[PDB]
Symmetry: C4
Subunit: 389 residues, 4 copies
């Protein structure tokens, strides 16, 4: 009936699943209406996985596709594609207008959520199946926004992290608890709770959820939020590892002080992601990604650890380079593929494609999952934005 976390399929590394690269098909002579997009993620039911993303109400090639750099507009929508369908106009399914999104399947129906509206009075609407069942208005009136990756559903309840407030200062996250799309509860995040954008969330055992977030203002360490679904509580932490996962970031281990010390830099950031191995009682291994560059959104390197990331300052263990340092790599996202016997967690990579500042912008999506013993291959796009018609 209801979705719930199982023990994960055994795996000791990350290996490539597939890649979607729609703008390979937007060159001279081509015959495709491709969908430029940003903030992609993947979410799955027991029947099918789907690639979700935020579009701009336009295809490429096309005269209007110059707006695709914008973060927020009346044009953007949360859309999705069956996973493995290329990202073309006829394959696209529109779910909700809005410019920040999340989605997750509870075992019976999809929940889709987007934020729509002006910056100072936006509203999250939650769609359950075909009906808008939930509505959650901005509480700090400064760009209400959510995960840009899948939410987590356990035992008929879904858990969504939202944040509202300045990009350059304190902004308090909230855990929304939904039931058939209705917001039935808000959970206050205690502990280290002054930031936490764009969380990538995965269940760590049968009843707990762990989210890896972005602190855009205070620290190059990523915030971590843990949710106890039985107690209905949430606590924020700062990831303690010397291997800082945000971009931009200082040299590894150079932040002086306790685990929860911000550091002197910390402005700016990017959505990050992780994967894991777990039994029904505990997570036994974690897998992390960060950029190759400590200053630009370029490259992707995988790491792993068997320590608790909220307690240990130990450096992470290098897995290898999944995207070379010369290749733009922007957001990454966590997701889980449910199975009848075991679950599997994965990391998707937003390989960015752009003609430049305030010009055409989109991506290619590469997917790696927890399986095997060594990284198999790195990913490239072989798309030159200059070649896009």
């Amino acid at each position: 009936e209801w979705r719930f976390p199982k023990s994960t399929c055994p795996g000791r590394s990350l290996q490539k699943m597939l890649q979607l690269n729609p703008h390979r098909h937007a060159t001279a002579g081509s015959q495709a209406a491709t969908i430029p997009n940003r903030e992609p993620f993947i979410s799955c039911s027991q029947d099918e996985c789907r690639l979700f993303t935020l579009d701009h109400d336009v295809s490429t090639p096309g005269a209007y596709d110059g707006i695709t750099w914008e973060d927020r507009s009346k044009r953007r929508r949360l859309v999705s594609f069956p996973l493995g369908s290329e990202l073309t106009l006829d394959n696209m399914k529109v779910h909700l207008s809005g410019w920040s999104g999340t989605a997750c399947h509870d075992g019976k129906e999809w929940t889709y959520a987007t934020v729509n509206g002006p910056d100072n009075s936006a509203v999250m609407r939650l769609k359950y199946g075909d009906q808008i069942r939930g509505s959650f208005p901005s509480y700090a009136n400064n760009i209400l926004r959510t995960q840009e990756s899948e939410c987590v559903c356990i035992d008929g309840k879904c858990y969504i992290i939202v944040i509202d407030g300045p990009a350059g200062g304190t902004a308090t996250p909230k855990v929304l608890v939904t039931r058939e799309g209705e917001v039935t509860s808000e959970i206050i995040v205690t502990g280290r709770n002054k930031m936490g954008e764009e969380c990538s969330c995965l269940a760590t055992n049968r009843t707990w959820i762990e989210c890896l977030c972005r602190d855009n203002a205070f620290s190059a360490k990523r915030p971590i939020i843990r949710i106890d679904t039985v107690a209905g509580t949430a606590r924020g932490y700062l990831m303690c590892s010397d291997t800082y996962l945000d971009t931009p970031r200082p040299a590894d281990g150079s932040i002086t002080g306790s685990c929860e010390t911000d550091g002197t830099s910390g402005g700016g950031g990017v959505k990050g992601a992780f994967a894991l191995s777990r039994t029904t009682e505990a997570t036994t291994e974690r897998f992390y990604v960060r950029t190759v560059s400590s200053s630009a959104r370029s490259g992707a390197v995988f790491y792993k650890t068997t320590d608790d990331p909220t307690e240990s300052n130990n450096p992470l263990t290098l897995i290898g380079t999944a995207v070379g340092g010369a290749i733009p790599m922007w957001y990454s996202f966590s997701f889980e593929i449910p199975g009848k016997v075991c679950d599997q967690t994965c990391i998707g990579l937003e390989m960015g494609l752009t003609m430049g500042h305030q010009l055409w912008t989109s991506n290619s999506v590469a997917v790696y999952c927890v399986i095997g013993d060594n990284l198999d291959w790195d990913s490239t796009t072989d798309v030159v934005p200059a070649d896009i018609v």
Copy 2:
């Protein structure tokens, strides 16, 4: 088994669901065969919602798409798209030839209905699943025509409003009662019954239906038709509110006389729409739309009331502007999304796009549903018809 009205999901305002905007993809360089269309509406089964519309047997760009301004021809068909699919040639499904349409799902099968034929001897055909099960010929031999929005099915019977007669004079509506597409009964509309085109209809409780119509000849007040499905009767009224909902219209409250007094103007009009909150016994709130302009089809403003619209001349309560006054806005339509626990009513807006008189004509469709506490955002198209190839 059979569809029947449930209590609606709680909601105190209208908030945006999604928007379809196919002709964003018909610009120079684009690679899409988009479907120009008019009189769109949405109807849902428990499985899926669908966007229905009347096409012209052509795509845009294309050499033949200059006929898309015509109301009636041998080219038009009732077609549909899964809701959320963009309106392209490969996504389209053709149901019936004809130039006035409606459709509704009874819980087991779709009923589709169109009027086909010459102006003076048209015929409504009703398709149930894959078979044409019903046929209803013109009774006044002057453009038989129907709702251009979904019909209402209760307990295995579907209710369709048709009208026949002059656009500028008395034309008597009829309620057709269908069972598996067969017209089993005609219900005579008593009361105020001299006009009533293009009705948008919703169940007001377990057994009654209310339709909001267009009087093209006599009044800027909209006619309202109520159907008692148990008694098998229908009665027409004139909406009494000072906030007149048709276009063109005089200043609010300036019509002198009783609730049912026409007023001195009243020629012309446009299809209108409403939404509601209801329990199984009674409607508890109504939501209305009208244009911003009192003379042109431009803009869309939402209103609400807890009064009976056939009894109260009280002004409606402003919700806010859903489409700015500088933006063409033509038809609007009511529809209902059925759910397993509650139903939800919505209003769709036909945001018109045209190069001018007897030139290319189509639209974008924005959808708002009853949910939340304040209007979230207004809608735009950002399509300039001059840019369409």
Copy 3:
């Protein structure tokens, strides 16, 4: 379980269902890969109807589409589209290579059949679901060929009419009886059996089938074949009505002699069609089509009769003109839409489109079904082949 004929939904005329017109989308500026085709027909399961046709392994516009006039080649295939999908490359489903075809659903699985091979040694292959279960080689080694419309399945057995032999002389038809695609029996057609191409077949009651065919060599009267599925016998007749249904044809009633007298002309012909009303015991009304012109394939006129067409020379009763005489109209085909409570028979019209002799050739398909009391409207294409890119 198994498909079997029910009493037909009540109806006293033919009225338009829909029309497919893919080459409206093949004009300058258009963005569609349309499928040029000939010999279309429709066949239905209880789930969906499908438009079948014979393609040429090409789309229009395209450099190779000049071969679309050919009757037989290694390029042609039996393909199909969900009924209501427009005839584009991405909507097409390929079933079998070959240049003469038929298909019918027995209640459990589709049977598809085509003839493939050279003129002097062609082979019919029969596909049941996904497997080729049947094979029937040419028996006269002179263009084995079949109905170009749906076969008829009763009680798990399907009935297919095939013919082999000269187009200008005696060619003996055979009734093939199939079970899960395997040819289990050949039925010898007795009586008037020297011709009978391209039969359109419908059940006339619970256990009998009637086929309306084309005599390409001897007569402007159409041959009729009746099959008794219980006895497993078939007998050929000549339609006796003064209203001769083939093209070309002499003036009505001018053939002198008995019902089975050929007449002095009779060379050439075209596939024809009929529809009917029936109970479980007997057919009570028949509906026929023929061209407007007695010499060219142009126009379509509907007729009806309550007489036995193998016994009565009475003229048929005019219903009206479904396609005007200035409009090319080639093949027509019979088909039946099964229902849970009643069945419905229909006639489809191949409205031909061509640039001329040995040039680009395709069609538009208009569908009329037995319902109502008067013909609703005639059909046009509004496609000028000169405009096709």
Copy 4:
């Protein structure tokens, strides 16, 4: 429940099913995004058959499609199409990145497998439904590679042949045994086991599998591998027939020595295929293909035999020419269509299309299945690569 081999539908020859030819639609004026590809094959579940192939992350026409000659890159993916859908961008479904592939359905879920990674450290990943359940790293670190045709699933276990090692020397094949995508066992191939690439495999009775392979280094005779699924053993043989099936090859019967003697030539080769008739206990007839030319990959000729191909040096019996000798014909592949009453085996032909060395490269796929008594027709492409835009 689980898939297992049944007796095959009776048939004594090979006859054409269908052909897919997407690049007929890539000519001047055409409107299709076609998918250039190589190493196609077909695999079926009880619900549907699917055409699998290895793409290049590009469509034709398009600026990037010049890489389509490459064997291995970071661009290639195992993709599939419902069998009968033409090979266009919107019809394509991406399963796994990689440049050597196989897939097979066990009765419950699809298993997909590809090899990804650099030549010296590639990794096979196995996807079961939506999850990557298996991982198998290169064991000789010299281009791990697999069948390029469907694997065989019996009683919940699937059997995949892999090889690793030099293309010009000894390379040891391994039989991988999978259960829900997990590699549970490796079976050592005994006997003649120094080569065996690109095996086409079919069950020969209820419990045994026979694979027809390519020896790229030692012999023009094809290796044959038999798997006993009950004992869990595999043994390699050399096909003994004087009618040598590989290309290039010496004159028939001119290899001097025993059945297992290599011969003095033997360098180079091509993937080959066979089909069969079987009961639940034994194979009763085998059908083989080879090229017309003994030196180039051109043409296709069918043969048959009732002898054991590992024991008899008897020449095979000619069936006839399926593709004329002037037409390029590259890989061929075995596959089986499961049925409820009987199974059917088939051979697909990769009819190659290329502009030349290190230029655009793709194919057309023709399918022949075991049915009937004589070959019905040969196949052509009528695609001139010079005409491709």
